Every structure is written in structure tokens, then in C-alpha cells.
Amino acid sequence: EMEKEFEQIDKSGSWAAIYQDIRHEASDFPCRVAKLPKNKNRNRYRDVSPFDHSRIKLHQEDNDYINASLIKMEEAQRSYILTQGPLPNTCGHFWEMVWEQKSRGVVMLNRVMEKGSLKCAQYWPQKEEKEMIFEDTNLKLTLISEDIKSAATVRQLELENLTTQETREILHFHYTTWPDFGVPESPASFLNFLFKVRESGSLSPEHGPVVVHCSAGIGRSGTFCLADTCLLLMDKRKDPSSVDIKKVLLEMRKFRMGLIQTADQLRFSYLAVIEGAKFIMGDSSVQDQWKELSH
Numbered sequence: 001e002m003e004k005e006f007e008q009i010d011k012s013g014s015w016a017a018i019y020q021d022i023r024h025e026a027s028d029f030p031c032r033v034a035k036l037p038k039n040k041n042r043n044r045y046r047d048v049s050p051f052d053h054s055r056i057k058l059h060q061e062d063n064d065y066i067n068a069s070l071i072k073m074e075e076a077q078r079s080y081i082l083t084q085g086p087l088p089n090t091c092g093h094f095w096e097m098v099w100e101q102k103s104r105g106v107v108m109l110n111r112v113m114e115k116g117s118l119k120c121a122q123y124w125p126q127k128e129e130k131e132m133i134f135e136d137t138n139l140k141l142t143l144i145s146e147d148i149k150s151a152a153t154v155r156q157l158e159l160e161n162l163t164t165q166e167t168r169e170i171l172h173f174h175y176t177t178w179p180d181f182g183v184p185e186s187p188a189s190f191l192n193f194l195f196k197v198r199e200s201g202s203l204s205p206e207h208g209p210v211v212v213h214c215s216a217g218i219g220r221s222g223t224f225c226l227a228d229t230c231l232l233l234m235d236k237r238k239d240p241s242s243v244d245i246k247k248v249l250l251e252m253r254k255f256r257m258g259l260i261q262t263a264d265q266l267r268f269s270y271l272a273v274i275e276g277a278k279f280i281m282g283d284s285s286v287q288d289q290w291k292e293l294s295h
């Protein structure tokens with residue numbers, strides 16, 4: 001069981017050693033496009049790059065590069081796009097990717113300002129009457145409505161292709177209480193947010209992959225996607241013991257480097273899957289519990 005391995009690792013203080021073993025065994029694939037000098041200002045961090053084989057290509061012949069990776073989980077049959085927090089010059093690229101990939105939801109796990117620094121550009125409008133037009137990619141973005149709660153904020157956005165005048169509704173899920181290089185306040189808070197994303201239908205295979213980002217698109221984003229995939233794999237087999245989290249994380253790291261950035265984030269993802277398992281196996285009352293101590 002996950003639970004017995006957790007107790008063994010905790011009793012033996014092995015999380016830092018377990019986590020380093022994952023870093024050592026993780027896939028190493030080339031990132032030549034990301035390292036091209038013409039793409040230097042499209043990367044937020046020089047040590048965070050998408051692999052060539054899984055990177056999302058923009059559908060422009062100018063420069064198709066965005067720091068974004070397609071995580072295609074074959075057995076779980078769920079895909080995610082993990083990307084960095086957009087830069088002041090890549091906000092148009094970001095929404096171009098959302099359009100071209102037909103994404104229904106965007107999951108944001110960071111704040112714009114964290115630890116006195118700007119970890120993400122203000123890539124969505126904060127006021128209904130002040131829409132954003134991204135001239136380089138010819139898209140218009142309008143805040144439709146906003147539902148703010150203690151731990152998370154859900155926004156409805158309208159994305160319009162100004163070339164064709166098509167409009168789409170994008171759901172923006174913003175978890176606002178997850179420190180950079182840290183963990184959420186509780187598993188219950190994290191799981192309450194995750195199931196809000198699930199219930200929205202944004203993860204449905206009828207849509208394009210959900211776009212998930214933090215500042216770099218690996219740390220908090222990797223924790224979020226690992227827990228969702230492990231809970232989904234449990235769901236398909238209705239069998240918690242068939243899910244090996246370390247192997248799932250290593251499978252995900254074939255598609256983007258550095259997913260989950262600290263040993264405590266790995267420990268928390270165990271906690272989230274173990275606690276979320278109670279819902280997957282048929283105890284739906286655990287959901288209102290999460291909302292009850294999500295306050």
C-alpha cells in the first residue's frame with residue numbers, strides 16, 4: 001500500500017533520499033529548440049526547458065517555440081500541457097497555444113508576485129470592462145465573471161480569435177495559497193481545488209489538454225498533475241495498490257524535466273493521493289469534509 005510505504009519512509013526519514021533517486025533516474029532528452037539564441041527571451045528560467053520531443057509548437061511559421069510540454073499519460077488516458085508562467089512577451093503565445101490546442105481550462109498554481117519577485121506576467125484581465133488584446137497573435141481576452149474564495153478563485157474568460165471572430169469560454173482555476181517551492185496548506189485544500197477542476201469538465205477528453213502552470217511549470221504543476229493521474233489510475237482499476245506513484249512520476253518526467261521540485265512536495269503528493277483515494281473508492285462524504293476544513 002501507498003500508506004505503508006509512506007509510514008516506512010517517514011519513520012526512516014528517507015524522503016530526501018527517495019526524491020534524489022527519482023532525480024537520478026529521471027529521463028534526459030535534448031532541448032535544442034529551447035536553447036536556440038532566438039528563444040532566450042521566451043524562457044523564464046535557463047534550467048527549465050521543454051524536451052524537443054514533447055514540446056508544444058505554435059501554429060505560426062514565424063517562431064513556433066513556447067516553453068510548454070505535452071504530458072501524455074498513455075495508460076491513464078489523460079493529457080496535460082505544462083508550461084511556465086507567461087512572460088511579458090509570451091502572453092500572446094500563451095493564449096495562442098490555448099486556442100490552437102483547444103484547451104477548455106487553465107490551472108494556475110502560483111501568484112503573480114511571490115517572495116518579492118514577479119513569477120508570472122498578468123496574462124488575464126482583472127476587470128470586466130478592461131479586456132486584453134494580444135496584437136502579435138490577434139486574440140482578445142475578456143473577463144466574464146469571477147468567483148473568489150479563501151483558497152481558490154474561478155474565473156470565466158472569453159477568448160476570441162480576432163481573425164475569424166470565433167469565441168470560446170475558457171475556465172481559469174487559480175489556486176492562490178500554494179507557496180513557491182512549498183506545499184498547499186493541507187491535502188484537503190488541495191483536493192478541494194483539484195475536484196473543482198475535475199467537476200468543471202475541463203479534463204474531459206472531448207476537450208484539448210488542460211493547461212497547467214506555476215512559475216516554471218514543473219514544481220507545483222508537477223505535484224498537481226501527479227496527484228490527478230494517480231487518482232485517475234486508481235479510478236480506472238478501482239485498485240489503490242496497482243498505483244506506484246514513483247513510477248508514475250518517472251513516466252511523467254519523460255515529457256517534462258524536473259516535475260515536483262522538493263522532497264516535501266513528493267511527500268505531499270503521497271498525502272493527496274492517499275487522502276483522495278477515500279473518495280475514489282466510494283466515500284463521497286470525504287468531499288464535503290475537504291470543503292468543510294477548506295473554510
Ligand SMILES: O=C(O)C(=O)Nc1sc2c(c1C(=O)O)CCNC2
Nearest residue numbers: 045047181214215216217218219220
Ligand atoms: O512555480 C513552481 O512551483 C516552480 O517549479 N518554480 C521553480 S523551478 C525552478 C525555479 C523556480 C522559481 O519559481 O523560481 C528557478 C530555477 N531552477 C528551477
Ligand SMILES: [Cl-]
Nearest residue numbers: 029030031032
Ligand atoms: Cl539539449
Ligand SMILES: [Cl-]
Nearest residue numbers: 110111112113
Ligand atoms: Cl496573482
Ligand SMILES: [Cl-]
Nearest residue numbers: 113114115116
Ligand atoms: Cl511578495
Ligand SMILES: [Cl-]
Nearest residue numbers: 087088120121
Ligand atoms: Cl513575468
